[PDB]
Design a protein around this ligand. Structure first.
Ligand SMILES: [Cl-]
Ligand SMILES: [Zn+2]
Lengths: 173, 597
């Protein structure tokens, strides 16, 4: 059933990341093992096969990827998506520049850059409400009001630090 | 929360926003300067107009946070920058007028043309009509003509505008709590709240003068020496005690005495430090040049140019059917996209050039981790020094052999080396005094120490005392000579060229030390130096991040602009000249004149 998340045609923004729940299924993980299609395969758990699972997916900037791992400060791990210190499996990425980026700029993908407080492992926040650094209902353009969501703008010409990359976090239970 | 916490959160919004608009304006100019279409030129403005509107909006919005209520150096440093209040502090109508004043001057300078009184139909502009005359022609009169025409037609034309320009720009300057527009520029070198790393807008003038003194003797002698050689060139026009005539100095102002090599060369016999013909024989191409430069830095502990650089840059002139402006340029467009625009020919100069350019690109990468507003060289002159350090090492015969472009069995004889330095001196040391006296008069006009009706009686008073140069025809207030130079009539800090020059040698020295270097400080090539590169990076990676004096320490070893490393570079010359001047007279009389009348 893995063909449905990787190989998939459209991906979500980190802030509103999608989880898939795959049970009963049989897959050999050999679909993933062999392939110089991936650029990141850090597996904070193991790498074998007993043939048995959660499969979150999304898009981040290149230099953003290093935050899909236990620890890491944030902006992304603080505000969009957070892995637990422990309970883990694997993390997967791939340069989708040709797909998620254009020579003219693709601003469809978003991420969050302001929040009161950090996220909890595997938490999510789909709220889009004017943010002031101290409660108080904001009302743009009033000074110190910001919309907490931001676009990415993926151009094909940018550095590899700034290219779009799709992610799939595989969690085991 | 505190003015600080709101300001942290203000900048953060700005960084991410600027990133976008800036990358849009950048990208636009790239597409333009490489493909001068008609649709392309349009948005090249739009994007840039948007971005410039964004700052205006942002800067004046950053007025809300009183910087004098914050402490996290960086945050204060960033906001300080963002408060580019600038020339909006004027009334909308004064700013209108000012930007017209500016704009017209820029136009006049490029469009300005002069006509041959001896031929109605033939008429030339600075580039390339006059510049060719000023750099090549051995005819005293023809020279005297070009030089005068220019300062006469466009010079006088810019006299009224510059007059108004000064008052307004001074108004602008006084409004932001600066003494004058002069005191405004010295600003670039200012440092506050750190202890010992501090520097003030006054102390520049102190240090630029204290330094310019140690340079005199070398200058005086280089002066004396080219003087005597010129006397042969134009016999009967020069006085063996008197200043040099402004028009016989090799360009339109004698900014650089580079073009006099032709007739000041010590030993005309020793010939080709020039691999142009050797690169051509091994069928070197654009690709090879840049791949080799890339290798050079790699050699010192620095990164391969990005894949983005290799598949995005424009390394050759794309012929006709698609035209470009071919000035060699380093581009840091942001978003981790770096590139170079260079219409490469397989010649030594371009081999050299491209090492300089890949210098800034290397610098750009270094400090790109820094918060958006702190990406940029530690001061107006920092980026150029770093860029020129590369030209110094890649030029030595040591490197040229190392890379198989110099036939292995060449000798480094003493005569070829004198010849070299003199060529170096003509440019590097020719301009140093000419430059200082430039901003000296500019500085003064701005502090108001020069009455409008003595703007030339004071120009040339200094041109004769500091630079040792004289006007070939007398110039009253009708003319406005200091503004016949681009940098002046097109609004630019010029001291940059004086301080970079010093910097660049303080660098090469401490680096050749670090790299362990045997011979005279100029035989130095810092390749394979690894530990000598580390010391460079250590500062390259700050950008505008730390006070510039610290930025320097990290390389040289102290907190100030020191002159001796430049003098060391020229010991082998300086002495050979004291000798040459044996019977020549050293120094000049301000009183003597060409017209003399
Ligand atoms: Cl002049
Ligand atoms: Zn440059």
């Amino acid at each position: 059933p893995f063909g449905e998340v990787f190989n998939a045609t459209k991906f979500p923004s980190v802030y509103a990341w999608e989880r898939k729940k795959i049970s009963n299924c049989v897959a050999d993980y050999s679909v993933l093992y062999n392939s110089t299609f991936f650029s990141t395969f850090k597996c904070y758990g193991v790498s074998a096969t007993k043939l048995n699972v959660y499969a979150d997916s999304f898009v981040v900037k290149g230099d953003d990827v290093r935050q899909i791992a236990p620890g890491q400060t944030g902006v992304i791990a603080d505000y969009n998506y957070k892995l637990p210190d422990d309970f883990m499996g694997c993390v997967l990425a791939w340069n989708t520049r040709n797909i998620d980026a254009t020579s003219t700029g693709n601003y469809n993908y978003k991420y969050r850059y302001l929040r009161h407080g950090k996220l909890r492992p595997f938490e999510r926040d789909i709220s889009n409400v004017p943010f002031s650094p101290d409660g108080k209902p904001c009302t743009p353009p009033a000074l110190n009001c910001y919309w907490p969501l931001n676009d990415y703008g993926f151009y094909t010409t940018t550095g590899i630090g700034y290219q779009p990359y799709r992610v799939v976090v595989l969690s085991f239970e | 929360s505190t003015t600080e916490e709101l300001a942290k959160t203000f900048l953060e919004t700005f960084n991410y926003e600027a990133q976008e608009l800036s990358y849009q304006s950048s990208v636009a100019s790239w597409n333009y300067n490489t493909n001068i279409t008609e649709e392309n030129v349009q948005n090249m403005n739009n994007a840039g107009d948007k971005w410039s509107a964004f700052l205006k909006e942002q800067s004046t919005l950053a007025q809300t946070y009183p910087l004098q209520e914050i402490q996290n150096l960086t945050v204060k440093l960033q906001l300080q920058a963002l408060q580019q209040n600038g020339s909006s502090v004027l009334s909308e109508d004064k700013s209108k007028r000012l930007n017209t004043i500016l704009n017209t001057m820029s136009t006049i300078y490029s469009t300005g043309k002069v006509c041959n009184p001896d031929n109605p139909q033939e008429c030339l502009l600075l580039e390339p009509g006059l510049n060719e005359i000023m750099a090549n022609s051995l005819d005293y009169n023809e020279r005297l003509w070009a030089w005068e025409s220019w300062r006469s037609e466009v010079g006088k034309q810019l006299r009224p505008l510059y007059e108004e320009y000064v008052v307004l720009k001074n108004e602008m300057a006084r409004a932001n709590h600066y003494e004058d527009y002069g005191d405004y520029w010295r600003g670039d070198y200012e440092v506050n709240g750190v202890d010992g790393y501090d520097y003030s807008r006054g102390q520049l003038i102190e240090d630029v003068e204290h330094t310019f003194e140690e340079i005199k003797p070398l200058y005086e002698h280089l002066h004396a020496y080219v003087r005597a050689k010129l006397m042969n060139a134009y016999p009967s026009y020069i006085s063996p005690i008197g200043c040099l005539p402004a028009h016989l100095l090799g360009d339109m102002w004698g900014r650089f005495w580079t073009n006099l090599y032709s007739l000041t060369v010590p030993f005309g016999q020793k010939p080709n430090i020039d691999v142009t013909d050797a690169m051509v024989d091994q069928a070197w191409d654009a690709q090879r040049i840049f791949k080799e430069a890339e290798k050079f830095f790699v050699s010192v502990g620095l990164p391969n140019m990005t894949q983005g650089f290799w598949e995005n840059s424009m390394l050759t002139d794309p012929g006709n059917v698609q035209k470009a402006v071919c000035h060699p340029t380093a581009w840091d467009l942001g978003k981790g996209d770096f590139r170079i625009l260079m219409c490469t020919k397989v010649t030594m100069d371009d081999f050299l050039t491209a090492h300089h350019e890949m210098g800034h690109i290397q610098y750009d990468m270094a400090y790109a981790a820094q918060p958006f507003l702190l990406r940029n060289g530690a001061n107006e002159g920092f980026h150029e020094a770093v860029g020129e350090i590369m030209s110094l090492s890649a030029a030595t015969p040591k490197h040229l052999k190392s890379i198989g472009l110099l036939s292995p069995d060449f000798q480094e004889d003493n005569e070829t080396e004198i010849n070299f330095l003199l060529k170096q001196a003509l440019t590097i040391v020719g301009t140093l005094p000419f430059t200082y006296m430039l901003e000296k008069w500019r500085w003064m006009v701005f502090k108001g120490e020069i009455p409008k009706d003595q703007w030339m009686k004071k120009w040339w008073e200094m041109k004769r005392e500091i630079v040792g140069v004289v006007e070939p025809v007398p110039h009253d207030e009708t003319y406005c000579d200091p503004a016949s130079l681009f940098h002046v009539s097109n609004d630019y800090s010029f001291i940059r060229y004086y301080t970079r020059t010093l910097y660049q040698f303080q660098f090469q020295e401490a680096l050749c030390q670090a790299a362990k270097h045997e011979g005279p400080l100029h035989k130095c090539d810092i390749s394979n130096s690894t530990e000598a590169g580390q010391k460079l990076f250590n500062m390259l990676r700050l950008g505008k991040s730390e006070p510039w004096t610290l930025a320097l320490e990290n390389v040289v070893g102290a907190k100030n602009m020191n002159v001796r490393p430049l003098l060391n570079y020229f010991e082998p010359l300086f002495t050979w000249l004291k000798d040459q001047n044996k019977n020549s007279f050293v120094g000049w009389s301000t009183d003597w004149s060409p017209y003399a009348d």
